[PDB]
Paper text:
The anaphase-promoting complex/cyclosome ([name]/C) is a large multimeric cullin-RING E3 ubiquitin ligase that functions to regulate cell cycle transitions by ubiquitinating specific cell cycle regulatory proteins and targeting them for proteolysis by the ubiquitin-proteasome system. Only four subunits are directly involved in catalyzing protein ubiquitination (the cullin subunit Apc2 and the RING subunit Apc11) and degron recognition [coactivator subunits (either Cdc20 or Cdh1) and Apc10]. The remaining 85% of the [name]/C mass corresponds to scaffolding subunits, of which seven are large multiple repeat motif proteins (Apc1 and Apc3–Apc8). Seeking to obtain insights into these structures at atomic resolution and to assist in the interpretation of cryo-EM reconstructions of the [name]/C complex, we determined the crystal structures of full-length [name] and the N-terminal domain of [name] (Apc5N).
We purified residues 1–161 of [name] [name] as a bi-product of the [name]–Apc5N coexpression system and crystallized the protein. The structure was determined to 2.2 Å resolution using single-wavelength anomalous diffraction phasing. Apc5N [residues 27–161 (human [name] numbering)] adopts an all α-helical domain architecture comprising seven α-helices. Helices α1–α6 pack to create an antiparallel bundle with α1 at the center of the domain almost completely surrounded by helices α2–α6. This α-helical domain is capped by α7, orientated orthogonally to the α-helical domain. In the crystal structure, residues 164–168 from the TEV cleavage site continue the α7 helix, similar in structure to α7 of human Apc5N defined in the EM density map. Residues 1–26 of Apc5N, predicted to form two α-helices, are disordered in both the crystal structure and the EM density map. A small shift of the loop connecting α5 with α6 accommodates the [name]–[name] interface within the context of the [name]/C. A larger 6-Å-conformational change involving the loop connecting α1 with α2 and the N-terminus of α2 results from both packing at the [name]–[name] interface and a two-residue insertion within human [name] relative to [name] [name]. DALI searches revealed weak structural similarity to the RNP assembly factor, although the biological significance of this similarity is unclear.
Residue numbers in the entry: 29 to 168
């Protein structure tokens, strides 16, 4: 269930909460605008970045480069993203994201990730590298 697109959405959610150039009110508005990405089907990294560029022009590049560094890194870099993301909510603001669409998405992604199989985690990281590579290969 956890795919490179879903990881990219987690990266987007993380980058949105960290954005130093918009207010907390604007962040709350943007989290509402982003909801169809959490509920919709998987899309290429190229399409996701194009969507993010339209509503969050700042974070689009930050999202793109974060995936780039994870893909150009090692398996540990994907595992470290999941660890840091799990410690980043309901214990930083500290706002309860439990009944929320974002909260349920963060929960269901971290749970499905942890109920791994080392084989499945390794195949997830390679899938992520190919997902990023597919965007990097584009002429445009």
């Amino acid at each position: 269930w956890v795919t490179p697109y879903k990881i990219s959405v987690l990266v987007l959610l993380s980058e949105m909460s960290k954005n130093t150039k918009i207010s907390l009110v604007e962040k709350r508005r943007l989290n509402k605008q982003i909801l169809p990405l959490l509920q919709g089907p998987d899309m290429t990294l190229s399409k996701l970045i194009k969507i993010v560029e339209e509503c969050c022009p700042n974070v689009s590049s930050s999202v793109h480069i974060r995936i780039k560094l994870m893909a150009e890194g090692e398996l540990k870099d994907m595992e470290q993203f999941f660890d840091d993301l799990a410690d980043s909510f309901t214990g930083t603001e500290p706002e309860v994201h439990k009944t929320s669409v974002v909260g349920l998405f963060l929960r269901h992604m971290i749970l499905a990730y942890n109920k791994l199989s080392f084989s499945q985690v390794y195949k997830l990281y390679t899938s992520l590298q190919q997902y990023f590579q597919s965007d990097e290969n584009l002429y445009f």
